[PDB]
From a paper:
PDFs are ubiquitous essential metalloenzymes which co-translationally remove the formyl group carried by the initiator methionine in bacteria, mitochondria and chloroplast. Here, we present and characterize a PDF enzyme issued from the bacterium Streptococcus agalactiae (SaPDF) which behaves as an excellent structural platform to describe PDF-inhibitor interactions. Like most other PDFs, SaPDF behaves as a monomer and its crystal structure reveals a classical PDF fold. In addition, SaPDF contains the typical insertions of type 2 PDFs12, including an eight-amino acids loop folded as an α-helix (insertion 2) and a long loop connecting strands β2 and β3 usually referred as the CD-loop (insertion 3).
This is due to the ability of the enzyme to deformylate formylated substrates in the crystal packing. Indeed, the free N-terminal amine group coordinated catalytic ion and was hydrogen bonded to the catalytic residue Glu175. The hydrophobic methionine side chain fitted into a deep hydrophobic S1’ pocket composed of several conserved residues (Val71, Leu125, Glu129, Tyr167, Val171, His174). Finally, peptides were in a conformation mimicking a β-strand which was hydrogen-bonded with the main backbone peptide bond of Gly130 from conserved motif II (E129GCLS133), Val71 from conserved motif I (G70VGLAAPQ77), and Gly69 which preceds motif I, linking the two β-sheets from N- and C-terminal sub-domains.
Author numbering: 2 to 204
């Protein structure tokens, strides 16, 4: 099966492992994982994080033919399980100094969900791109500005976390994948760039 291919020690996830728009798995509601995790599920999480690291390294990205990513969901690998990985780098300052913290968010999350959120909505000014979508898709992807999430890590430890800004957008995008929701489902059907008063546009 798909998972057997992905969990092989020497196997590096690349674009050929990512399923594309139209594949029914992207529209399913992914199954909850049970704890303790299987070895396959633990390894898959690790491989997913590894993919994101590789995608963000200019040379490894070039070697493996990767588009940069800050998140990945298991359904995009044809694995209908509630497993996501998120990796959001902090940026250098104008002087070229590395940030205090390499990442603002770095986690492999099992059974993540939004448990509460702001009334305020937000959207990235630049829209959103999807590793499974090989089309130009313009528009504001309207999301919650702020979310409180729960998830479990690979050990089965439960976490509760409030997110805002870009990190909030990224986690919501990944949770959507495990619910069978695509970013363009949240773009206004008539005017992609419609702005409802109070929408927080993140630059
Ligand atoms: Ni592969
Ligand atoms: Ni391990
Ligand atoms: Ni590596
Ligand atoms: Ni709770
Ligand atoms: Ni609500
Ligand atoms: Ni995506
Ligand atoms: Ni919601
Ligand atoms: Ni539409």
């Amino acid at each position: 099966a798909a998972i057997d291919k992905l969990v092989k020690a020497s196997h590096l996830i690349d674009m050929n492992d990512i399923i594309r728009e139209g594949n029914p798995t992207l529209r399913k509601v992914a199954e909850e994982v049970t704890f303790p995790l299987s070895e396959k599920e633990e390894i898959l999480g690790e491989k997913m994080m590894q993919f994101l690291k590789h995608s963000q390294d200019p040379i490894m990205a070039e070697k493996l033919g990767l588009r940069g990513g800050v998140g990945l969901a298991a359904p995009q690998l044809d694995i209908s399980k509630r497993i996501i990985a998120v990796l959001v780098p902090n940026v250098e300052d104008a002087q070229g100094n590395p940030p205090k913290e390499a990442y603002s968010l770095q986690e492999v999350m099992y059974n993540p969900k939004v448990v509460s959120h702001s009334v305020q909505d937000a959207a990235l000014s630049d829209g959103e791109g999807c590793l499974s979508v090989d089309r130009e898709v313009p528009g504001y992807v309207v999301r919650h500005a702020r979310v409180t999430i729960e998830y479990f890590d690979k050990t089965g430890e439960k976490h509760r976390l409030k997110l805002k800004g870009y990190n909030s957008i990224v986690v919501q995008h990944e949770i959507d994948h495990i619910d069978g929701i695509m970013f363009y489902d949240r773009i206004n059907e008539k005017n992609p760039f419609a702005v409802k008063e109070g929408l927080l546009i993140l630059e």
